[PDB]
Amino acid sequence: MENFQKVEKIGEGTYGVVYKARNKLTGEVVALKKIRVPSTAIREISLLKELNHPNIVKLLDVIHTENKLYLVFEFLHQDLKKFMDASALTGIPLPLIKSYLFQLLQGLAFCHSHRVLHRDLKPQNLLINTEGAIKLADFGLARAFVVTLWYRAPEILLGCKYYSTAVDIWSLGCIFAEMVTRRALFPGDSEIDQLFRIFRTLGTPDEVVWPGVTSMPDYKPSFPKWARQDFSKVVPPLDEDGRSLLSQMLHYDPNKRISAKAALAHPFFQDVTKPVPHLRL
């Protein structure tokens, strides 16, 4: 809309480009996304406007004009990928990691309770502000409408057509590990490299740990068989409570994977607080 003055491109996705923009008539600063128009898309996106929660980036307006689709979102000041890179030397303080994980699980528990999945969680769509808040962005968009495979759940990689809310828990678990170790957990650069990286760390799944896995669409009996490795080796700095929680977030069987709601009650969050991040914007 000519109702906005584009300041700068704050990113790009496959579902569209995102810009920092100012509302030409109200001076308000926002994140303007021009979607890259079916009625179903319009209806699903319209549903997202009501899905409001303190840990979900607010969708301010939906502008379907001149047969185009623009999404006006609230503008935060930093995404988690940049914050992680900037904190690479010391690493994000554990209390902050815990706070962020707790908040994101609250956001997920909320959307999941409304049957809405994100499907593509990653540091780039997790936005933070100076007050210690972290929020889920660009979600509900996947189902409504190089791509990184690093946070993709194994059931999606094995070809499951109807995945559940568990896919989000898996992605968040990978991000949790990344914040703690300062290295991506499963940095695959292809679908099979991604799958095998997961197998080499958590062990090749079988019917014992994941009933029904061998009949999944893309499963091959020829998959090499790797043994699982201790979480003590995978996320060393993390204490037992965090390790136990992470292990339940990375269960192979989606039905065995912990829910966001249950994760909130895990002992790991017994001492959760809300520290302020060291931001440089």
12 marked as part of a ligand binding site: yes
CB atoms within 10 A of CB 5: 13
Dihedral of the alpha carbons of 55, 60, 62, 68, in degrees to the nearest 10: -100
Residue among 75, 102, 196, 252 that touches ligand 89E (CB under 6 A)? 75
30 marked as part of a ligand binding site: no
Contacts of residue 136, defined as CB under 8 A and 6 or more positions apart, other chains included, come to 55, 56, 57, 104, 107, 108, 111, 118, 121, 125, 126
The answer to whether residues 161 and 155 touch, using CB atoms and an 8 Å cutoff, is no
Question: Is 120 marked active-site?
Answer: yes
Interruption sites in the chain after residues (C→N beyond 2.5 Å): 36, 145
Give the whole-angstrom CA distance, residue 35 versus residue 22. 18
CB of 74 to ligand 89E, least distance (A): 6
CB of 76 to ligand 89E, least distance (A): 4
Residue among 77, 182, 200, 274 that touches ligand 89E (CB under 6 A)? 77
**Selected range binding ligand 89E among 67-75, 113-121, 154-162, 241-249, rule: CB under 6 A:** 67-75
Residue among 31, 108, 185, 198 that touches ligand 89E (CB under 6 A)? 31
For 2, 40, 145, 257, the CA distances from 63, given in Å and listed in that order, are 11, 15, 15, 38
Give the whole-angstrom CA distance, residue 270 versus residue 264. 9
Kindly provide the b/e burial profile for residues 196-214, where b requires at least 16 CB atoms within 10 angstroms of the residue's own CB: bbbbebbebbeeeebeebe
CB of 94 to ligand 89E, least distance (A): 24
Site for ligand 89E in 121-140 (CB under 6 A): 127, 137-138
CB of 6 to ligand 89E, least distance (A): 14
Tell whether residue 32 is a contact of ligand 89E (CB under 6 A).
no
Where do we find the tokens 């790797």?
226
74 marked as part of a ligand binding site: yes
Q: Is 212 left (phi over 0), alpha (psi -120 to 50) or beta?
A: left
Give the whole-angstrom CA distance, residue 82 versus residue 123. 8
Tell whether residue 120 is a contact of ligand 89E (CB under 6 A).
no
CB of 180 to ligand 89E, least distance (A): 23
Tell whether residue 22 is a contact of ligand 89E (CB under 6 A).
no
Query: Which CB atom, from 129 or from 248, has the smaller least distance to ligand 89E?
Result: 129
76 marked as part of a ligand binding site: yes
Tell whether residue 11 is a contact of ligand 89E (CB under 6 A).
yes
Residue among 56, 76, 108, 180 that touches ligand 89E (CB under 6 A)? 76
Residues taking part in catalysis: 120
Q: Which residues sit in the known binding site for ATP?
A: 10-18, 33, 74-76, 79, 122-125, 138
Residues lying near ligand 89E in the complex (CB under 6 A) = 10-11, 18, 31, 33, 57, 73-79, 127, 137-138
